[PDB]
């Protein structure tokens, strides 16, 4: 419930500057010290300014769900999946193209 500016995150009694997309918090700020950020390791990403200690694991494209991987995740963006021909997906979620719908 304490409030922080835009692009800060709350840790104990401190509002800390956020890390940029592609980075995670390596060290939280302190009384005398600003945030330390590190780039996402392989197979992880962050797509937004953030206060996460770790980057998020990259998604996998489930071929049982009718998906193929169309583009590999990068450190600032998750794996892009697509449906097989004859399906459509709705990109409405944080999981984006993840369900292969078909007309009846």
Numbering used by the authors: 39 to 142
Copied sentences from the primary study:
HVEM is a TNF (tumor necrosis factor) receptor contributing to a broad range of immune functions involving diverse cell types.
Here, we report the structures of human orthologues of members this network, including the ternary hHVEM–hLIGHT–hCD160 and binary hHVEM–hLIGHT complexes; we also report the structure of mHVEM in isolation. Based on structural and sequence alignments between hHVEM and mHVEM, the solvent-accessible mHVEM residues close to the putative binding interfaces were mutated to dissect the interaction network and enable in vivo HVEM functional studies. A total of 52 mHVEM surface residues within or close to the likely ligand-binding interfaces were individually mutated to different amino acids to probe the effect on ligand binding and to identify variants with selective ligand recognition. The mHVEM H86D-L90A double mutation showed no binding to mLIGHT and WT binding to mBTLA and mCD160.
